[PDB]
Amino acid sequence: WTATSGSCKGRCFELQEVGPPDCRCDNLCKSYSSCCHDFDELCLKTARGWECTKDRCGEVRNEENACHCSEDCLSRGDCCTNYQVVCKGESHWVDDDCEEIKVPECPAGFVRPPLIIFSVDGFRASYMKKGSKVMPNIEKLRSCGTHAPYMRPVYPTKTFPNLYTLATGLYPESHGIVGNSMYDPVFDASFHLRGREKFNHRWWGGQPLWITATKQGVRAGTFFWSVSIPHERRILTILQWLSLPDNERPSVYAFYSEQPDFSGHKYGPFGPEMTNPLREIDKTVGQLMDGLKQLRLHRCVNVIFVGDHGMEDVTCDRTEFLSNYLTNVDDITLVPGTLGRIRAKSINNSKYDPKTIIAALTCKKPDQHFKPYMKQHLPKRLHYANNRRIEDIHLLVDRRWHVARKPLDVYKKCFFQGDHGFDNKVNSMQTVFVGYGPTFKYRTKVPPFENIELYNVMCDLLGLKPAPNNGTHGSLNHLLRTNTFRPTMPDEVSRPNYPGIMYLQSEFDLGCTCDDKVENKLEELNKRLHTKGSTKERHLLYGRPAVLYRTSYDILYHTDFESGYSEIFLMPLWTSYTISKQAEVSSIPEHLTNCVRPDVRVSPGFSQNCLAYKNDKQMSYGFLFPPYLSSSPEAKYDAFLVTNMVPMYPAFKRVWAYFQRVLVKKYASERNGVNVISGPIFDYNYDGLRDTEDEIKQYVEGSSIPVPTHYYSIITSCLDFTQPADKCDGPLSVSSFILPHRPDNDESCNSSEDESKWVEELMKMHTARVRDIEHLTGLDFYRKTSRSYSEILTLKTYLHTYESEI
Ligand SMILES: *[C@@H]1O[C@H](CO)[C@@H](O[C@@H]2O[C@H](CO)[C@@H](O[C@@H]3O[C@H](CO[C@H]4O[C@H](CO)[C@@H](O)[C@H](O[C@H]5O[C@H](CO)[C@@H](O)[C@H](O)[C@@H]5O[C@H]5O[C@H](CO)[C@@H](O)[C@H](O)[C@@H]5O)[C@@H]4O)[C@@H](O)[C@H](O[C@H]4O[C@H](CO)[C@@H](O)[C@H](O)[C@@H]4O[C@H]4O[C@H](CO)[C@@H](O)[C@H](O)[C@@H]4O)[C@@H]3O)[C@H](O)[C@H]2NC(C)=O)[C@H](O)[C@H]1NC(C)=O
Ligand SMILES: Cc1ccc([C@]2(C)NC(=O)N(Cc3ccc(Cl)c(Cc4ccc(Cl)cc4)c3)C2=O)cc1
Ligand SMILES: [Ca+2]
Ligand SMILES: [Cl-]
Ligand SMILES: [K+]
Ligand code: NA
Ligand SMILES: [Zn+2]
């Protein structure tokens, strides 16, 4: 109950939310049905519209008007945004040439340049070029300020997960807004776009920018706007808050537009009906910039123009129905649309089987337009698993399609031509970023980046210390003319051992055999130098990775590769090697097919053993440095060391061997040499973070050899591919992946064919940032390069997406 018969007189768009049942006058009162009786009359004035006309110039103030053209309006802070243009011969902001803003040019009393976030729903990245003719204000922000060709949203590319990611720097799995709709089993409660449950604070985790600011003594405008408040009134309210006395004036503001998303759903991303919404958004930007110029703030405020996600063509007829696949369709609940999330209709049902549901949905029709996953098997780059609100069964839906439970759900809800929510690497889901102001660079284009990074920059823009988040602070320094943050490399926690020859062959009883007893100060001086690190500068191009947790491990040198070998996990944490453009692929000789050799540098007690693999009927093994790439028949014996061995399912060896035999060489010839770092990943609790030893759920049968959940590789070369990878004078180029270590290839529907038809497709799907691998391994890469650390941080956040040119 609200005693809604208090009053909004002198309180319109108050910044503090008043405690019930006292009635409210804040920009969200409408949404809670709790405004004071006179809210509309006082706070939502509309009389005479939004623009001064010649005949209103220097009029007598009439408090009924929506905005004013009377002489006193500037000092009152409530002129129409075009007041000066109409009544003072001023030009619109968009008609003035741009001039570099080297320093903030602010009125006295401003302690720091304000930040205004202008967020636009459904603003697809290609609108910047495709709509440029009808968006002159936006085009000026873009070309005069700092801009990316696009900005990557988070998965799912829905509105609430992305806006809240913008506010917090957190993946949806950590902030908790994991979809536009959700069920939470611990609360036993549901969350929807419509309704009042979304207003409960228990859904909203992390610490959003407005709370970070408040806690640190920086005042914040309200980020949320009730939908019925028109855009012109949102702009005028921001401009009014900017005229408050210094002790009352917020330093950060957000504007939100429902467009172009609202229209995009109805007409598709490029419908002819899309021109007008783009025109109208541009006009709103113009109102803001004219209003800022009137208050002498247009060279003082930092403005961010940012989308939450793009928009794809999607219609009714492109719907897959689970009823065409399942027989128990009524025993499941589906969260439907551009992604699928499946749970049991009833938890008092012990007959419900996730395994059988998955099998009924896997590769069942030739043209199938979705792919089922247990959430822990989703590409690691989506970071979409570690939340009790994300159902165990997930469906990744093809771009342009929907999934639904039954046809009745679709024709008893054609309406829509546009939608979004798909995989966040899909081109049509990409959105926009422009930063304009004293703190941003002038006329600068930066490479595409992920929206998880902006929270850190917005904190920097406001002199705030960010709460812990998923951005990599410093990776966006190149956006800024002056940074207050200067990242430093994390300290190594564990220093390695460098073992020499310490064991005799006969101390090993590992059940291994090798035909290598088929066995001179030329060649024997040589091999000792190699085992001491003589070739290390060739295979470790960027220094050794630093181990950032407490553990026991050895550096092992070899002619063709170096490794950091874990005495705890009984395998390398990383193996590093360089393949020049000219390298030769050879095969594994017949006499070496089953060869595994004890490593006399490493004790029996810290080694794997061949018997365990013989005994484990499911588990086979592979090698991290590939034998196919040995530099010589003699160096090839090094690749069969028991310290280069890792556990692999036979189904996985098909993937791995094709990568090592075919694709490494192809990348080296295309990229003019590559450096490769490969290794295992253990993430049994799917939290995106390295597992401790006591978290491992599977061992090779009868042994202490832990089974990886994933294998990664990081492939580095010179950005200027006219220089060889091992002699690169400038910026680096990287692509990486985190392949799931699975006992079957069900994920690839073409897997019964030759690896050349399906393997590379799988690796592309599981593309990763070096930063994802860092979290997953507790390692820190690129510690010794000639590049600046900020540039290295940008490099580690890069994602190679394999999409074509937007
Ligand atoms: C992306 O960035 C984020 C932010 O940096 C990273 O997430 C962090 O990861 C940390 C390590 O996993 C984690 O630290 C833990 O926090 C526990 C206290 O957490 C509460 O307080 C914080 C601080 O205010 C708050 O932010 C938390 O918020 C979570 O939970 C609330 C309420 O449930 C949600 O509203 C909110 O959205 C958020 O949920 C997310 O995180 C939880 C896990 O915390 C997940 O379950 C959810 O799915 C969701 O993702 C909390 O309110 C703290 O108690 C933990 O301590 C245990 O473990 C340590 C290990 O050192 C040990 O020393 C302790 O003794 C303790 O062990 C005891 O508890 C165990 C488990 O109950 C038990 O088994 C033991 O036997 C012991 O009893 C732990 O330190 C941090 O909270 C989150 N922060 C956030 C915001 O998510 C994330 O890792 C990054 N992602 C990647 C890929 O890098
Ligand atoms: C609980 C609640 C209350 C009201 C509402 C309203 C009316 N419904 C709705 O869709 N919006 C927009 C909206 C959506 C999500 C978030 Cl987080 C933000 C904040 C924000 C803005 C910009 C940036 Cl860059 C980041 C965050 C704004 C509302 O305000 C949504 C949700
Ligand atoms: Ca983990
Ligand atoms: Cl959703
Ligand atoms: K086996
Ligand atoms: Na298959
Ligand atoms: Zn939408």
Curated annotation (Swiss-Prot):
Give the start-end ranges of region Required for secretion: 773-794
- Domain SMB span(s) in chain numbering: 4-47, 48-92
Alphabetized InterPro entries for the sequence: Alkaline_phosphatase_core_sf (IPR017850), DNA/RNA_non-sp_Endonuclease_sf (IPR044929), Endo_G_ENPP1-like_dom (IPR001604), ENPP1-3/EXOG-like_nuc-like (IPR020821), His-Me_finger_sf (IPR044925), Phosphodiest/P_Trfase (IPR002591), SMB_chordata (IPR020436), Somatomedin_B-like_dom_sf (IPR036024)
Renumbered residue ranges of the record's region Phosphodiesterase: 94-447
The highest taxon in the source lineage is: Eukaryota
Which positions does UniProt annotate with glycan attachment?
3, 348, 360, 470, 750
* One GO term describing the cellular component: membrane
Q: What is the top EC class of this enzyme, as a single word? A: hydrolase
Q: Describe the reaction catalysed, as an equation.
A: a 1-O-alkyl-sn-glycero-3-phosphoethanolamine + H2O = a 1-O-alkyl-sn-glycero-3-phosphate + ethanolamine + H(+); a 1-acyl-sn-glycero-3-phosphoethanolamine + H2O = a 1-acyl-sn-glycero-3-phosphate + ethanolamine + H(+); 1-(9Z-octadecenoyl)-sn-glycero-3-phosphoethanolamine + H2O = 1-(9Z-octadecenoyl)-sn-glycero-3-phosphate + ethanolamine + H(+); a 1-O-alkyl-sn-glycero-3-phosphocholine + H2O = a 1-O-alkyl-sn-glycero-3-phosphate + choline + H(+)
* Motif extent (Cell attachment site): 76-78
Kindly provide the PTM information from the record.
N-glycosylation, but not furin-cleavage, plays a critical role on secretion and on lysoPLD activity. The interdomain disulfide bond between Cys-363 and Cys-749 is essential for catalytic activity.
Recorded consequence of changing residue 380 to A: Impaired secretion. No effect on lysophospholipase activity
Q: Which family does it belong to?
A: Belongs to the nucleotide pyrophosphatase/phosphodiesterase family.
Q: What name does UniProt use for this protein?
A: Autotaxin
Q: Which organism is it from?
A: Rattus norvegicus
